[PDB]
């Protein structure tokens, strides 16, 4: 259709959202969730017969 500056505007939005996700969101979300999973994994590892 009409070749328009909106494409480059949307590219700026796309790249900055990916960078914000990489910096702020993803590392802490995965850290908290997998730290719960780690605690349950050790809950398996902990289990008086031994």
């Amino acid at each position: 259709m009409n070749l328009n500056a909106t494409i480059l505007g949307q590219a700026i939005a796309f790249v900055l959202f990916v960078l914000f996700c990489m910096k702020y969101v993803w590392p802490p979300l995965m850290a908290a969730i997998e730290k719960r999973q780690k605690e349950i994994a050790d809950g398996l590892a902990s289990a008086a017969h031994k």
């Binding site: 902990s46 008086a48 017969h49």
Partner: protein, 52 residues
């Protein structure tokens, strides 16, 4: 599991630690019994031989 581990470990170890020493002192009671019986019959043997 950790609580029952503590409880069972202490229970087992302290119970056996008591009974072992108790049996060893019982063996000393039998030791004193045997030693005094040997002494008494040794001197009865001597007295009977000299009376003979």
């Amino acid at each position: 599991d950790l609580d029952l581990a503590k409880a069972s470990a202490t229970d087992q170890l302290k119970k056996a630690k008591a009974e072992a020493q108790v049996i060893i002192e019982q063996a000393n009671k039998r030791r004193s019994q045997i030693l005094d019986e040997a002494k008494a019959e040794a001197e009865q043997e001597r007295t009977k031989i000299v009376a003979q």
